[PDB]
Amino acid sequence: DQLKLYEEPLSKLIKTLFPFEAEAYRNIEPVYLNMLLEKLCVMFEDGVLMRLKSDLKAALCHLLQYFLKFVPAGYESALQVRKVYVRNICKALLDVLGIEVDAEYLLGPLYAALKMESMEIIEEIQCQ
Amino acid sequence: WRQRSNTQGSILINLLLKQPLIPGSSLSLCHLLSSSSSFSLSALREAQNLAFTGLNLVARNECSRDGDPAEGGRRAFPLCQLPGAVHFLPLVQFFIGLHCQALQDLSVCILEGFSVTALSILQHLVCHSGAVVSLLLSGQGQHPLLKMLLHLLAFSSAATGHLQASVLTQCLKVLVKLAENTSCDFLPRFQCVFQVLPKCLSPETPLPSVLLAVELLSLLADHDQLAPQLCSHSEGCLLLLLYMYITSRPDRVALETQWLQLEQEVVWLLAKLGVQSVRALTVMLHRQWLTVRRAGGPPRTDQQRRTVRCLRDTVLLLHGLSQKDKLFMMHCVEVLHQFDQVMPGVSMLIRGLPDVTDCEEAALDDLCAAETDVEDPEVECG
Amino acid sequence: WRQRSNTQGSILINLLLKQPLIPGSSLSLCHLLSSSSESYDGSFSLSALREAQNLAFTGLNLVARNECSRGRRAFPLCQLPGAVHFLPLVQFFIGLHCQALQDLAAAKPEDSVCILEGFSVTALSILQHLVCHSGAVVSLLLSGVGGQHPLLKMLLHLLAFSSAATGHLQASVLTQCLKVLVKLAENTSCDFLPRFQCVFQVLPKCLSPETPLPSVLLAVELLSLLADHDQLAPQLCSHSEGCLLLLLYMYITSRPDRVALETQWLQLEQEVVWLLAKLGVQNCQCNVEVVRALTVMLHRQWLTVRRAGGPPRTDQQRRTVRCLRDTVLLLHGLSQKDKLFMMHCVEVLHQFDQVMPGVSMLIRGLPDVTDCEEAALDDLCA
Ligand SMILES: [Zn+2]
Q1: Where would one find the signal peptide in this protein (chain B)?
Q2: Cβ pair B283, B327 in contact under 8 A
Q3: Smallest Cα–Cα separation from B55: which of B37, B35, B82, B78?
Q4: B326 touching chain A per CB within 8 A
Q5: Residues of chain B with C-beta less than 8 angstroms from the C-beta of C89
Q6: Are B153 and B194 in contact (CB under 8 A)?
Q7: Chain-chain contact of A21 with B302 (C-beta, under 8 angstroms)
Q8: Could you give the CA distance from residue C181 to residue C253 in angstroms, rounded to a whole number?
């Protein structure tokens, strides 16, 4: 219930500070969002998706989306640092994928991650 | 709350040691020390060592700890004392002195990129220390960097170009930061820097400098002595230029989102002008009401949500002016058609918002210009 | 603790930020973060250079925000993440001039590799700092292919380069990389100790007489760190030419070129006696030579202290007399371990016999006397 009483304001703050619209990252300093990135990383190391009670988890996954697709890679931290970040991320996402009742707030994250993977693969096979 | 955000509450050395805050030019700070380039390596390396020492100090600086009870004053959000950036100030002082010397003569251009990176540096500095900004303002020519940055503002007010165009933006950033970081008592000594703002209010200045200037105008109008002094100008009490910038719309590459930021800042400044005590309001309401009325429901995008709130506080300002001054109605006759069409539209649209105010709503019930007509002749129509 | 963690992160970043780390080397951490680097540009392009540089800048931000907490590793320094993120830039700058030394060896250029080597001196100082308070980068290095870690491979490569010839730049960069290496050996565990066997092959060229005393001193410190391994302790002798022992003792006996003050001398001797104590607490002419060298060092120190007994008031004086104490205990250990001691020390035995009553009187003069050393002296009496 302690979670419940601030769940929806928390998610609203996520969506507002991290809107879907691109360029939303330019409003905030990249070191801010970089420490936010490592924060979300260590959160997924905690398996928050299992450890939390309310799936409305959906907000943190939407934040993960904000990081991945709207915010470019290499702006907050380096592309290798952000890469190992999202590596730990998607590994934790797999661990929680093994056991879940609903997938809607999780399938989107995986889609975004594999999408960026597809794009970088296309770039490294730019013409071959 | 034990780390006190020493790392965030510091200079943000992570920010100070980060890829160019400004767009491009790929700088970082001692890259400038690597760059051997107040005209000599003499005192250049002195300022470099002072800045490196100040950086090490701020890294080791824990001025505020566990909650910061030491920072006191009427100034809200007193960052911390942070004597470290004081030692970093001589480097930007020297670089901006070189820049001002390169500006006063009809030279080189790289110093100007170094200059704007130094301005970004200053923005970072005054962002995280109240003692630093207090000495920046206090120290006639006190703190020659302050007078020379005023001279930079004057140099950029004419013969804009592109480098000085960026200098406008970053210097307005640091001033509005210095202004907002200063208490009410420092506004009287900030009046000397405020004297330069009218040149930035010239019809030439680009939109980012314009919106930063409006922010500075608001910060100054928070003072009770700075507001009448700024309104003591000639043209329109220094606000005619601002109002005609609303109606004029000088830039087309400037996105209407940035224009909306400008508009909200202007209307909030004028609302503060009311609490410390028409053509432009009507034309911006015309554009914004067209944009919102073309949409059939609540703004799903954030930009149009801000546009709707802009409608809200703009009709607030309109009813404030009308109740304050009855000359509002014949200040409206020249734009009476725009007004009589926007007012009912924007009032119905805000009625579409479930939340209520009853003050802005009382304003709606007060103005409520309706039907804009009597009837049109149906005979020989179209 | 996390407070101590934040302080140690601040200490690391400060040791990175300062005046150029290695006094006299006008280059600093920035000297690497933003480098013009005019011309291996193939393996490390200018784009790859800026890539390593912003990798490093991000890592520096992280260690500014660091909270790295803490039998395998001797001291729980930090286990700091931003260290391996500096690892890109230092890897770049250390493969730099390593490729170039390799190319100049292939030719058998210099004007550029002098600057490259100054850059790498600064980089190796950064390496020492990031093995001062770390353990993520310290453990990651210890994880080789077998095989070796890439940065470890390149540093060992340029180490063999500088150890083969002790010319202009090689001596200085060698001193720096040996500092790095002794830090590694201090911060590693017994499992990674056999990985430094390649360093055991590179080391004879380091303990050559032509190498200056700071370098060989760091090499002796490294050897003493390595001695704590049943696999490394046997890696001393049974090799006729010197086995990194005959060379050490001919160095301490006949100091080459002696271009240093007196207290600079006997630093090697202190490290040597500590190393031999380490070996003891664990017949080459590796066994025979350490006898006459120890006697001659004890003799010269007994002269320098007997010429003016006085009180141990200067730090070099107490250092010399403590060196005398550990030296005579080591000589007693040498007499215990070998019987040919008296027989094969005859060429210098007289210098030992004259010192014997004087050294015993000095020892008895010390208000602190370890009974082991007293009885050892008594056994040395005949
Ligand atoms: Zn031997």
Answers
A1: none
A2: no
A3: B82
A4: no
A5: none
A6: no
A7: yes
A8: 26
